[PDB]
Amino acid sequence: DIAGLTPCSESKAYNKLERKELKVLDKRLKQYEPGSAPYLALQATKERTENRFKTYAKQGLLCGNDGLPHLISDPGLALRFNHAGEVFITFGFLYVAGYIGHVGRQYIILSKEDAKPTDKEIILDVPLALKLAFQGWAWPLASIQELRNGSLLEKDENITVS
């Protein structure tokens, strides 16, 4: 009940929308036999809709004036209340993104220490790429240990015109 919003568990617009979708899906049930493939498909879609509304609700998710769930993003404001899960868990993307970056940077540096590193880019060295992909699980430790040693950057060896 922050930023003027209300929990999805006590909102009339949320229930109104839920019944609307359950009704528009149920209107298509009369056009088919009670035991065929379109009937089974429509029944599976109805079960998924009921489960999603139940899953979206009772999990601290709150909506505002229209039944649509809103998301709290300020840390602290999302930590003082049970709203950390909605967007404060940015560390999942940061982990996968840093994993991709560390694997690519390790492949660029290692491949450059070879005669003509070009054809190694158009024709990947798959045993070296697979070995470097499964070796970068602890990428933040390698990043902090490669920064203190100064092996992450260059001093002044850049094609500049400044």
Partner: protein, 41 residues
């Protein structure tokens, strides 16, 4: 055989190995686990 396995390292290793793996992983995650809007905390 060496020429075929080295041919398989140009464009398929990046456009059909990773693409098929990543697409299949995200699709199977969204298939067994239905639609995820929060960390379910």
């Amino acid at each position: 055989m060496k020429d075929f396995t080295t041919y398989l390292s140009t464009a398929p290793v990046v456009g059909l190995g990773w693409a098929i793996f990543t697409s299949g992983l995200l699709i199977e995650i969204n298939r067994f686990f239905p639609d995820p809007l929060v960390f379910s905390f």
